Amino acid sequence: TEQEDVLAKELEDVNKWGLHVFRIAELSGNRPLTVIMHTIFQERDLLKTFKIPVDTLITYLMTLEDHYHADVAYHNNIHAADVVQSTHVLLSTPALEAVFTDLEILAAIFASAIHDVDHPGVSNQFLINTNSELALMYNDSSVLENHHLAVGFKLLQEENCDIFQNLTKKQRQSLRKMVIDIVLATDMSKHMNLLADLKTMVETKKVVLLLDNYSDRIQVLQNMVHCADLSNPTKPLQLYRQWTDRIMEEFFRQGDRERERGMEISPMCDKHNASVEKSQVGFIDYIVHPLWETWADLVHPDAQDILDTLEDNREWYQSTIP
Ligand SMILES: COc1ccc(C(=O)Nc2c(Cl)cncc2Cl)cc1OC1CCCC1
Ligand SMILES: [Mg+2]
Ligand SMILES: [Zn+2]
């Protein structure tokens, strides 16, 4: 059909920063995660490498995508697809050519796909403050991130969903550990330590990059997926602005729930006292730029255009304040 033709055209940009992910979400019948993951697996020849039956891959992806919430403005299947695609581009950076094994690549992409599954659209702190079942289950420690992993892995046990059925026991064990390490590293409470470790690696860099032990390799993959998670402000402005609209809607809905419960409204969650532009500038200045500038240093000069875009977008948001 004409719609499938346009979808195919948009997917030709799967290896490019700035893919039209929202268009792909609409054109695919709200299956951005499934089609983008399928496309990336085909591009990297992962189905052949790991003997993943095509029908099994699609069944699992659709099932996984179904577990992202349709009514959460930001932490939905589009965000998952975007992080998957951004990770895919970061993995292809020239400075990392031939550094990671096929299993490591698979782990990073799979981790990206499941990293926010079944997100309720409220933060770890909200879950902790409201004595939620999730916080009680996970003892207030990386509550959501533990849950995303539990769901992502559990779904593999559904009928015709085990995409790792042909991996060896050793490969399955290794992949499981890497995926857990990567998704737990997406908790923002770990951001400062992750960044500190990334800077230490840049300072002791040996060169393409030379990573010999699990600690260094996993650290890079953790930071890579974390960069993808924090990549919105580095994308072309039309995409960035949509991500900002969505995160603010989600935050405002949390603030509304907090207000209904008589709780104090969390930072940036009060629709009656918000500064969207100032908040984006602060977000870039204190979190996004420090991380991306460090990533850019590790893979210099591969990420120069991404960092330039980030800086341009920071200047644009800042210009709307006066
Ligand atoms: C497009 O703007 C934003 C996008 C993403 C996030 C953000 O914190 N994402 C995130 C969250 Cl909410 C939790 N764990 C990890 C990540 Cl990366 C935060 C954003 O803006 C901040 C939050 C509200 C205003 C500043
Ligand atoms: Mg998350
Ligand atoms: Zn995320």
Q: Give me the DSSP letters along 213-271.
A: SHHHHHHHHHHHHHHHHT-GGGS-HHHHHHHHHHHHHHHHHHHHHHHHTTPPPPTT--T
Best residue among 192, 223, 246, 247 to mutate for probing ligand 1's pocket (most ligand atoms within 8 Å of CB) is 247
Task: Decide if 75 is catalytic.
Answer: yes
- Backbone torsions φ then ψ of 23, nearest 5 degrees: -65, -40
Best residue among 190, 223, 227, 230 to mutate for probing ligand 1's pocket (most ligand atoms within 8 Å of CB) is 230
What is the distance between the alpha carbons of residues 147 and 119, in angstroms, rounded to a whole number?
Answer: 9
**Cα 247 to ligand 1 centroid, rounded to whole Å:** 7
For atom 1 of ligand 1, which residue has the closest CA?
244
Pocket of ligand 1 (CB under 6 A): 186, 188, 229-230, 232, 243-244, 247, 251, 268, 279-280, 283
At 71, list the tokens.
Answer: 């009514």
Atom from ligand 1 closest to the CA of residue 75: 12
The distance from CA 187 to its chain's CA centroid, rounded to whole angstroms, is 11
**Cα 115 to ligand 3 centroid, rounded to whole Å:** 6
**Cα 260 to ligand 1 centroid, rounded to whole Å:** 23
Q: Which of 1, 2, 32 is nearest to 11 (CA)?
A: 32
For atom 13 of ligand 1, which residue has the closest CA?
188
Instruction: Catalytic residue, from 20, 38, 69, 75: name it.
Output: 75
Cα distance from N-terminal residue to C-terminal residue, the chain: 49
- Nearest ligand to the CA of 80 is 3
Method: X-ray
For atom 18 of ligand 1, which residue has the closest CA?
247
**Cα 207 to ligand 2 centroid, rounded to whole Å:** 32
Contacts of 58 (CB under 8 A, 6+ apart): 34, 38
Q: Which residues surround ligand 3, an ion (CB under 5 A)?
A: 116, 229
CATH fold of 1-322 reads Catalytic domain of cyclic nucleotide phosphodiesterase 4b2b (1.10.1300)
Alpha helices by DSSP H, listed for the chain, are 2-11, 21-27, 32-43, 46-49, 54-66, 77-91, 102-114, 124-129, 133-138, 143-154, 169-184, 191-203, 214-229, 237-260, 276-283, 289-298, 304-319
Residue 287 CB coordination number (10 Å) = 16
What is the distance between the alpha carbons of residues 285 and 291, in angstroms, rounded to a whole number?
Answer: 10
What is the distance between the alpha carbons of residues 164 and 102, in angstroms, rounded to a whole number?
Answer: 13
Binding-site sequence positions for Mn(2+) = 116
Q: Which of 152, 139, 211 is nearest to 180 (CA)?
A: 152
Atom from ligand 1 closest to the CA of residue 251: 23
Atom from ligand 1 closest to the CA of residue 233: 1
Binding-site sequence positions for 3',5'-cyclic AMP = 75, 280, 283
What is the distance between the alpha carbons of residues 306 and 304, in angstroms, rounded to a whole number?
Answer: 5
**Cα 187 to ligand 2 centroid, rounded to whole Å:** 6
- Nearest ligand to the CA of 247 is 1
CB 104 within 8 A of CB 181: no
